[PDB]
């Protein structure tokens with residue numbers, strides 16, 4: 001067990017292994033930047049706020065730990081460390097999570113740079129999706145990059161949200177994330193938000209202006225009577241020609257955008273398919289685009305007591321094995 005020290009930070013007493021030095025609040029659970037003297041990395045240390053206050057808090061804590069422990073990929077945020085000052089389950093109150101300190105996020109670029117950034121996003125998404133996980137909130141502030149332009153997917157704007165989410169469809173597919181990637185890509189290439197909706201309905205309005213109103217094939221798959229009736233009352237607008245929207249873009253980029261920003265989620269390109277697109281020819285390497293181990297999400301269906309979620313969480317803290325540097 002490492003020696004901890006205590007220090008008042010964000011109006012509470014943080015208690016962290018001495019390897020983590022010079023904690024500096026970075027926002028708000030609450031996060032401090034620190035220097036990990038064991039690894040020589042700048043890291044973010046997150047002290048969970050009220051992790052076991054309620055059954056929901058407790059399940060949420062356990063989810064977040066489970067997810068972070070699972071994610072072991074260059075383009076996805078992972079867990080460098082997880083700790084508690086508690087020496088037993090009985091004393092177990094606080095959970096700290098340690099990750100790479102990400103120095104900037106994506107919040108116009110050259111086509112070479114966009115290729116590289118979007119490649120990294122897709123590589124990470126191929127991984128995430130292979131675990132049967134859907135991000136559901138990809139956006140520029142959830143994409144961290146360092147000074148070598150190495151990108152990691154992390155974790156109110158609706159500008160990047162797939163239309164079916166905006167419509168509370170449920171039954172989302174993984175290509176909700178691909179929609180988001182198309183939106184980010186478009187913006188990197190143009191320097192302008194693709195669908196800067198002012199409110200919820202406006203977001204859908206802007207989306208349909210670009211991609212057209214649903215065709216006959218998509219209409220067949222819409223169970224909602226209210227949705228169908230509204231849609232068929234709309235003035236049928238065709239898909240815009242993306243080649244004339246993204247003026248002067250690499251035609252491969254335009255072709256990729258067309259394959260991502262398809263109204264029907266079943267017809268959007270997958271992350272693995274997109275990595276094989278010619279746009280990424282200079283990065284694509286089937287040998288090093290790994291998939292994830294299977295992720296046991298069964299806990300999501302469970303309604304357990306605080307002390308049970310806590311115990312499970314304590315189990316995961318105890319079993320944690322740091323990554324090799």
Ligand SMILES: CCCCCCCCO[C@@H]1O[C@H](CO)[C@@H](O)[C@H](O)[C@H]1O
Nearest residue numbers: 163164171172173221263264265266
């Ligand atoms: C007027 C606005 C209409 C927007 C149409 C969104 C269509 C999204 O695509 C759909 O999404 C679902 C969710 O995974 C699926 O179950 C469907 O098979 C699919 O067609």
